[PDB]
From a paper:
LL-37 is produced as a precursor protein in human cells (e.g. leukocytes or neutrophils) and processed during its secretion to the skin, lungs, or reproductive tract. The active peptide carries a surplus of positive charge, which is attributed to interactions with the LPS or LTA of the bacterial cell wall, and negatively charged lipids of in vivo cytoplasmic membranes. We determined its atomic structure in solution and the putative membrane interaction states.
The second structure (termed LL-372) obtained in the absence of detergents displays an anti-parallel dimer formed by two α-helices without supercoiling. The monomers are identical to LL-37DPC-1 with each amphipathic helix extending to ~5 nm. Intramolecular stabilization of the monomer is provided by backbone H-bonds and salt bridges (formed between Asp4 and Arg7, Glu16 and Arg19 and Asp26 and Arg29, Gln22 and Asp26).
Residue numbers in the entry: 1 to 34
Write the structure that this text describes.
Amino acid sequence: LLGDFFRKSKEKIGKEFKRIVQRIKDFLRNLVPR
Ligand code: NA
């Protein structure tokens, strides 16, 4: 129960990291004029 709460807190940090990095990648790629 409590262990799962702490684990999910760690997992959420990981998910947010991934989402932010993906957003940055997409943004940078979208900057290149066509
Ligand atoms: Na963008």
